[PDB]
Amino acid sequence: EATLPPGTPVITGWSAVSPYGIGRAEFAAGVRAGAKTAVKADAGLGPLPSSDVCTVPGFDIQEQLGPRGTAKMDRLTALALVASDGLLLDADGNRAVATDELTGVVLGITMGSLENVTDFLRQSYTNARPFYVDAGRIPFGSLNHAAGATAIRHDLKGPNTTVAGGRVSGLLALNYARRLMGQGRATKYLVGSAEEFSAAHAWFEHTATASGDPAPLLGEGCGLFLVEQAEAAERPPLAAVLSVETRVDIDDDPGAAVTACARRALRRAGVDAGEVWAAVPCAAPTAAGRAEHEALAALVPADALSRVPSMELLGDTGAASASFQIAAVLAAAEADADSRGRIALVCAVDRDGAVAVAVLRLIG
């Protein structure tokens, strides 16, 4: 708290909509319990490469967000919006976080709503003319739509960014926020990442899988953080973001890239690897995921890996991954005095070659 460099970002709040349910509480409960989330996929999604899915249970867009502008709303946007409400509002819909025009928004994604874009293109191919699409779905298609919708919803006129990157996107987002806040472009930031479950996503993932491998267990949801400057923080810090480092695995040695990335992140945080109390890999069901796990299992105290349940319990949550990882750390840390001042490390690897690592100091 008092030990922190000047202008260190702090997370002062979080929210999640996840395969554990809607809300931070459900996420925290699921993480602490190391609960399973896989269910049999709803018949409505049509044929899927696998029947088993980690969807958000009890998630209905109109039920959550009401009737206005929700009929054609993509699930990705819906998840982000519900998460935004958990972050900025309390359980009674009171305003928990004071936002203004210097409140930034940055959301990480993989490739937006593939459900939207694939529905649009299916219509384009199969309807009377190739621009005879569901025109009401078009606003929702933009990759930046979830971030933009969040801003419309909460009147956030400040910086509004969407970054891609898949599993690393939450960390790219975090680093982006960190840098912009560092430059005075925002005093507070809503940072996070999101991935919807869609038949399109599921089929594309299956297609992209290293031929032979089983259809991945896929999850979905959104995790969001309220980030502030430690000096100016208007709510108690839960964690300080000490460093976020990234690399690209250009030599197809994801282990080596994870190792290099983590060591750099730890150096830049000014901490030793032995100080890591919780280490949360993304657990991607890929060679890179396995390599990441092996790399961290060597790099950090073994006890740091047993501290938080495997992210595998949520399935491959795609872009949501790193945000769920950070949230799992915060969930593990909350209501456990043992976590105070401890270092946490979150690591993710993405198919498209990116590696990212964040080092946090747990406060409370």
Binding site: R129, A151, I250
Partner: protein, 401 residues
């Protein structure tokens, strides 16, 4: 605060490839409009876009297999190669540097997504889809392949998906990243590829021109979809000076605003806020702006709103306000990056590129749009505007070094 300069430009565009070809196109009022080849235009009643005509990936791409990228990725990588070439930077100089690579995009490999669906639709079977396509459709890849091609592992590769504003967001992020001191170099820009998704989207919006793009024209009828890539090398002044680098222009500042109003419609207040933020970041007065490179898409809504915002900020004598998309068409994620480069080149070469296809200025856009012909000027400071869906505005201010 650390000063940041543009030491390299890479350009793949509908009006020219490379800094030379592109400076020529801009000065010429070249129009990049040509028939669409990338996909089947049957049924659209219309088949013009601003494609890159004669792209040869082999000129630029050495290391990354072409099938690892769709077209947008190829453009990104080619422009990146060109840009680092243009900066006097080799893969050897780059491997050593912690860097940011930030590529903006609207649609990414949405063409590949369409082809994937075609495969499923032809076969009536999801299992007909090509793994090679499905592996390369995610936008994050646009940034990471550059790192791959230039052999730069020590990179933050961030694709910014803020659509038409994404190039300016990316340059701004480079600026912030260098200003922070954490990196001395950033490859920033944007890339997109013509696709059926974008064509059909704008068609269905009634935002496609039936002939040509006429920004700020009284009878403007919309856009043409475009593509390409612009990559800018940003460098700390320290690092540029110390390296003997030719400096094209200086990055002074940018501004980001969000309209927080409408998912697709532009917002006057939102654009105006972005401009004002950019001027404040740049440390620059309305007076000192030589011209605005307008978002200027050529749609009814955009041009009247953007004009209004400009007039709000500058008063009723705003600077000359030109629309590069008159020539490029709307190159989506590349648009603001290609605009930025045009702005830097305008600074460097003392010209203001034209708003072409200009018959008659909309009376509600009371601007000097530098119609149809480039003019000479003592261009020292330039504003590059960009607005996108989801109310995302980004305004970039460049200056003479």
């Amino acid at each position: 605060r650390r000063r940041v300069v543009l030491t390299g430009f890479g350009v793949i565009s509908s009006i020219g490839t490379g800094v030379e070809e592109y400076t020529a196109g801009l000065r010429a009022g070249r129009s990049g409009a040509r028939p669409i080849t990338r996909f089947d235009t049957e049924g659209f009643g219309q088949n013009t876009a601003c494609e890159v005509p004669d792209f040869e990936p082999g000129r630029w791409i050495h290391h990354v297999p072409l099938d690892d990228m769709g077209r947008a990725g190829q453009y990104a990588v080619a422009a990146a190669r060109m840009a680092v070439d243009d900066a006097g930077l080799t893969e050897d100089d780059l491997g050593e540097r912690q860097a940011v690579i930030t590529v903006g995009t609207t649609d990414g490999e949405s063409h590949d997504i369409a082809v994937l669906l075609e495969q499923e639709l032809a076969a009536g079977d999801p299992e007909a889809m090509d793994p090679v396509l499905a592996r390369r459709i995610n936008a994050g890849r646009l940034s990471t392949v550059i790192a791959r091609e230039l052999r730069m592992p020590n990179v933050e590769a961030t694709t910014v998906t803020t659509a038409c504003a994404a190039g300016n967001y990316s340059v701004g992020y480079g600026l912030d990243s260098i200003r922070s001191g954490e990196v001395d170099i950033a490859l920033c820009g944007g890339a997109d590829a013509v696709c059926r998704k974008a064509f059909a989207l704008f068609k269905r919006f009634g935002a496609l021109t039936p002939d040509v793009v006429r920004p700020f024209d009284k009878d403007r009828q919309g856009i043409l979809t475009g593509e390409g890539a612009g990559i800018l090398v940003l460098e700390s002044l320290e690092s540029a000076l110390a390296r003997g680098a030719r400096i094209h222009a200086e990055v002074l500042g940018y501004g980001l605003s969000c309209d927080a109003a409408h998912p697709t419609a532009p917002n006057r207040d939102g654009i105006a806020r972005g401009i004002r933020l950019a001027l404040d970041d740049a440390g620059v007065e309305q007076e000192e702006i030589d011209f605005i490179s307008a978002h200027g898409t050529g749609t009814k809504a955009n041009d009247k709103t953007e004009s209004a915002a400009i007039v709000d900020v500058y008063g009723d004598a705003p600077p000359r306000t030109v629309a590069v998309k008159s020539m490029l068409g709307h190159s989506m994620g590349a648009a603001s990056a290609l605009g930025a480069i045009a702005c830097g080149l305008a600074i460097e070469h003392g010209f203001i590129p034209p708003t072409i296809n200009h018959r008659e200025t909309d009376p509600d856009c009371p601007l000097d749009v530098v119609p149809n012909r480039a003019v000479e000027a003592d261009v020292r400071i330039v504003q590059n505007n960009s607005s996108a869906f989801a109310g995302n505005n980004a305004v970039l201010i460049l200056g003479t070094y």
